[PDB]
Amino acid sequence: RFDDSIIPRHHGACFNVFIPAPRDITALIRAGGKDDELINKKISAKKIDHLHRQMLSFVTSRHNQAYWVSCRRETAAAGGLQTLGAFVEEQMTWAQTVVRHGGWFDEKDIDIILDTAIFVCNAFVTRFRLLHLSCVFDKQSELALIKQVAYLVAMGNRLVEACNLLGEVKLNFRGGLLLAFVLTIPGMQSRRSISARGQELFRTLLEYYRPGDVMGLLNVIVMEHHSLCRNSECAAATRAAMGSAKFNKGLFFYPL
Ligand SMILES: [Zn+2]
């Protein structure tokens, strides 16, 4: 007797056990210039919020902005979904912060982390399509949407079309809400071109986002499909999509 059910064997590997969560940014500048495990780039929502003035004078400083922006886009062009989910996390948590402090998405003046939201978003979704979406999503109604939101963003501009498409749909299933979080900073940055119902969706996703949510949703989605998907190629593609999580040269922090 035993019962192998009470073991979360579906949870996969575990390199860090769950640990319960309870003025200098040069270490964050130096994290940006190197690839590292995310646990080495990690930081707390409230640590960043304490460091807003200072990290703001860094990301909006003119010196090397051209390099950090190209460098981030270079990583995101070659990174897998672990890199890109890391970038999406960093920018979602950064935005949420600058807003709380009275900032806004004004394309005039450059913010390193923000000036790449749309590039990073395009890159993630383009990599999402490397999955066997058909195997993953299941419900035909959900897969139908997800596949289309991925079609528009991945091919061409068409960001407004994908933002608008999401505003119409109810996002009570994980795959769509994920992609919504991905587009939330492209969404806000495109606020005066999208449907009012989009404008409201992305606004709320932004204010209701907590720093784990994107790497979380991506994790549990991939995790639970592969508790049953015995398919050899679907698993092989899932592995290709998320490459090294240690390929993040442009990333300044991984938020929590
Ligand atoms: Zn599968």
Author numbering: 189 to 210, 221 to 454
Question: Paper's wording?
Answer:
Previous biochemical studies showed that ORF57 is stabilized by dimerization, which is critical for its function.
After data calculation, the cubic crystal consists only of monomers in the crystal asymmetric unit, while in the spindle shape crystal ORF57-CTD forms a dimer in the crystal asymmetric unit and the resolution was relatively lower. As the cubic crystal crystallized in the buffer which has a very high concentration of the salt, it is possible that the dimer was dissolved into monomers by hydrophobic interactions during crystallization. The monomeric crystal belongs to space group I432 and the final structure was refined at resolution of 3.06 Å with R and Rfree values to 22.5% and 26.9%, respectively. The observed monomer structure revealed that ORF57-CTD consists of 11 α-helixes and two short β-sheets. The structure of monomeric ORF57-CTD forms a globular domain which consisting of bundle of 11 α-helixes connected with unstructured loops of various sizes. The N-terminus is represented by an extended “arm” region lacking any α-helixes, but only two unstable small η-helixes (310-helixes). The electron densities for residues V168-R189 and P211-D220 and S455 are not visible in the monomeric structure. The two monomers in the dimeric structure are nearly identical, and the root-mean-square deviation (RMSD) of atomic positions is only 0.528 Å when superimposed, but the N-terminus of the monomeric ORF57-CTD in dimer extends out to a different direction from the N-terminus of monomer if superimposed.
